Write a protein that binds this ligand. Structure first.
Ligand SMILES: O=S1(=O)N[C@@H]2[C@H](O)[C@@H](O)[C@H](O)[C@@H](CO)[C@@H]2O1
Ligand SMILES: O=C([O-])C(=O)[O-]
Length: 780
């Protein structure tokens, strides 16, 4: 039984008093509101908000039974008696409190009938998590396959078919009930922590995600090398083995940007060395020479690190002396049993912990380490009586990884202000993307079910802020012999998801260079394709940094008024133009692709398909996976390089997918030096735009470049433009008003500037794209 008593306005923030206490309402933007219950009392700070202490001017109007607090898009309607807040985008009801807040911490809201609810971060439950209840407690799920209620990286957040996102801004051991217990109730619980939620509205899924990333954090553009080929396993045992792997990528002609060193870099055994955080010199005798030798070949070194310092490690005594470890209530260092041994957890919430850990990262980065892998940040084992500077284990648990990322991100920016940190981690919180967190889906089984779950996991994490969510390609856990077909399908899918990092337990090779001739002959041209496609992928990365638009988009983005599409987890968009359907079972001979209505081309074969709603049936082969290109797409390629350190766009090849059904189409290619963290803010980039205008008698391309450029930017790019499904009735090309004849023979066999291949329905234009505007006009 709860009721309104009065309200003030203080710094654009509404402070409401009920019978039970104070509620602080602050607009973080015009479409996002923070609702802090128990506002009177000392709580943990926000973790989800990029700017916790922000509140923009809202308007307040007062009636007899209700207040109205509006930002411009988002309206909080406060019913006085009984006390209940609901949320409106204009006059459309998004979300209404039931009993709202109670006591342990509890929040209760109504679900509308037919409302579909994405969220919870990593679960394998189905895209619509409505009818599910699960804990908010980051925890390992070793060897998962086709089902999980609880994994490495949960998020206390949901996305509704009503186009809101709700964040439970609380770090503690908790739970989410998505109308499981009570078919029309959503309930958020925690054992402790902050009594706060955040509602975000949008007019569309893309503007919802832009609004969400606006207030929770935009991922800084990663270094372009994060889009490259990683050599990884658990684990290279020696410097000799690591050098032999880099050498194997060279001799097998696979692209390689980065080699990842697992826990053998700091000890000879899995158990008992964790916390050493320094080279095992018996097995890595000349690590500085090793990293420098790799850097000469354009190869970066990434080292694993973990929160745990074992009592058996060389750094136990020094960590205890520095007060770097979390304490028991008696005030000693807390020691407990991990799989790896007996040890403590570095307290990243403490000054002493942060400074001690930071110092070690700084020392190893100076030796040549380019990037960082932070594993076990759930934290994997976190006994409930462990004490951090700001709270107990159960209170801070789901933010440990978040703060570890912040600490490491701030540290890397202070050491290398002109470089973009690479931080790969297993667990974080809402907003962790603002610290450049790159998550992976942990210890997936080497099974088809493990592969078949990855699109679901990726989309659930992408939708709520994590564009660079990826899997251990080929699978991680157990198996005794390679499942070749599964491995091949997994590394094909890998080309079309965020981070190309095969990784697995080393009794079976994870790296493609160690596979049989057939496997290499399939994957080598696809790993080259990934590099040739860097202008496509890096542009999707740029859009992610700008608007939070994830690199992987769900099928349901294609039709926002068809909620039945929300359940789809077998087909997704890789950037704007590619609809990818991974093969996630053995011997699949054909697939049914629920392609949105319109025109689509086979990415591999150029075949044109039209549909008015009916799915498309494509045959499958071992050498590819089904990929359709949207009519009106501009697909940009550069020549393949071994390493992004050698990346050049001196030579562009752009494939435009023409169809009269798309009278207007736009593309963009974002180019910068691939390394400057300030390139976007300081406009030190080359943004290429392409516009196609397709009428009955003409096809007109407008090309332009904006931005201030960057050092090494080519003034003039040799451009081959390949027009797919081109009309056979084009006679004449104008380039900037100068008329050129279109050749109709020997296109592949002359230095033709415009040539039509009648057999392939491809019109090839070869020209110079310099700094000035270029118009290409084809006419019948
Ligand atoms: O519990 S594990 O076996 N799984 C953890 C990570 O998830 C793996 O990626 C990594 O290779 C392992 C070795 O450092 C870690 O130990
Ligand atoms: O697309 C066209 O305009 C054609 O086919 O001639």
């Amino acid at each position: 039984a709860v009721f309104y008593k009065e309200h003030k306005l203080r710094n654009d923030g509404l402070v409401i008093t009920t019978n039970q206490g104070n509620i602080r309402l602050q607009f973080k933007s015009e479409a996002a509101i923070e609702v802090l219950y128990r506002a009177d009392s000392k709580q943990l700070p926000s973790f989800a908000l990029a700017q916790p202490e922000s509140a923009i001017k809202a308007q307040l109007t007062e009636t007899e039974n209700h207040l109205q607090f509006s930002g411009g898009t988002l309206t909080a309607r406060i019913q006085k008696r009984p006390f209940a807040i609901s949320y409106y985008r204009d006059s459309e009801l998004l979300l209404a409190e039931e009993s709202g807040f109670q006591v342990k911490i509890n929040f209760r809201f109504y679900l509308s009938p037919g409302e579909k609810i994405l969220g919870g971060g990593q679960r394998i439950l189905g895209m619509d998590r409505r009818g599910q209840r699960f804990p908010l407690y980051n925890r390992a799920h070793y060897g998962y396959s086709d089902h999980s209620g609880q994994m490495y990286f949960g998020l206390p957040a949901i996305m509704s078919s009503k186009q809101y996102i709700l964040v439970f801004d609380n770090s503690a051991s908790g739970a989410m009930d998505i109308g499981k217990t009570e078919s029309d109730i959503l309930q958020l619980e925690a054992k402790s922590g902050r009594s706060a939620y955040i509602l975000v509205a949008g007019n569309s899924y893309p503007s919802l995600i832009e609004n969400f990333t606006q207030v929770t954090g935009r991922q800084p553009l990663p270094p372009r090398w994060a889009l490259g080929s990683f050599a990884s396993r658990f684990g290279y045992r020696s410097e000799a083995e690591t050098r032999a792997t880099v050498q194997k990528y060279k001799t097998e002609d696979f692209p390689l940007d980065t080699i990842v060193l697992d826990l053998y870099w700091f000890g000879k055994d899995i158990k008992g060395h964790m916390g050493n955080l320094d080279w095992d010199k018996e097995n890595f005798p000349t690590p500085l020479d090793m990293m420098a030798d790799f850097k000469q070949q354009g190869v970066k070194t990434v080292l694993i690190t973990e929160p745990f310092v074992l009592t058996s490690s060389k750094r136990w005594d020094d960590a205890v002396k520095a007060k770097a470890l979390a304490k028991d209530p008696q005030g000693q260092p807390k020691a407990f049993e991990l799989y790896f041994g007996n040890g403590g957890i570095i307290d990243v919430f403490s000054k002493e912990g942060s400074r001690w850990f930071s110092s070690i990262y700084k020392d190893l980065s100076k030796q040549g380490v380019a990037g960082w892998w932070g594993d076990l940040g759930e934290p994997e084992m976190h006994p409930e009586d462990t004490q951090h500077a700001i709270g107990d284990a159960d209170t801070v648990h789901n933010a440990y990884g978040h703060r570890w990322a912040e600490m490491l991100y701030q540290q890397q920016l202070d050491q290398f202000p002109e470089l973009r940190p690479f931080i790969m981690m297993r667990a974080g919180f809402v907003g962790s993307q603002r610290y450049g967190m790159i998550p992976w889906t942990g210890d997936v089984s080497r099974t088809w079910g493990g592969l078949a779950s990855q699109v679901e996991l990726a989309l659930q994490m992408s939708l709520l802020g994590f564009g660079y969510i990826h899997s251990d390609l080929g699978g991680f856990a157990d198996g005794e012999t390679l499942d070749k077909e599964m491995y091949i399908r997994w590394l094909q899918y890998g080309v079309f998801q965020p981070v190309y990092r095969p990784h697995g337990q080393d009794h079976i090779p994870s790296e493609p260079v160690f596979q049989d001739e057939e496997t290499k002959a399939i994957l080598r041209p696809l790993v080259k394709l990934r590099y040739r496609m860097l202008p496509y992928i890096y542009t999707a990365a740029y859009q992610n940094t700008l608007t939070g638009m994830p690199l992987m988009r769900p099928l349901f983005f294609s039709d926002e008024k068809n909620p039945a599409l929300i359940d789809n987890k077998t087909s997704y968009f890789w950037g704007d133009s590619l609809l990818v359907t991974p093969i996630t079972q053995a011997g699949v001979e054909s697939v049914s692709i629920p392609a949105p209505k319109g025109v689509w081309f086979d990415f591999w074969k150029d075949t044109r398909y039209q549909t008015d709603g009916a799915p498309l049936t494509l045959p499958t082969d071992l050498h590819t996976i089904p990929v359709l290109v949207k009519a009106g797409a501009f697909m940009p390629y550069v020549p393949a390089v071994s390493t992004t350190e050698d990346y050049r766009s001196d030579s562009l090849e752009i494939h435009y997918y023409a169809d009269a059904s798309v009278p207007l189409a736009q593309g963009e290619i974002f180019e910068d030096d691939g390394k400057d963290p300030n390139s976007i803010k300081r406009n030190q980039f080359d943004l290429l735009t392409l516009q196609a205008t397709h009428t009955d008698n003409q096809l007109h391309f407008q090309l332009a470049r904006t931005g201030k450029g960057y050092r090494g930017m080519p003034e003039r790019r040799a451009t081959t433009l390949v027009i797919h499904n081109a009309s056979d009735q084009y006679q004449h090309l104008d380039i900037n008003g100068k008329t050129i004849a279109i050749a109709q023979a020997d296109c592949a066999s002359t230095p033709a500037l415009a040539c039509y291949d009648q057999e392939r329905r491809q019109l090839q234009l070869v020209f110079t794209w310099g700094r000035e505007a270029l118009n290409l006009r084809l006419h019948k």
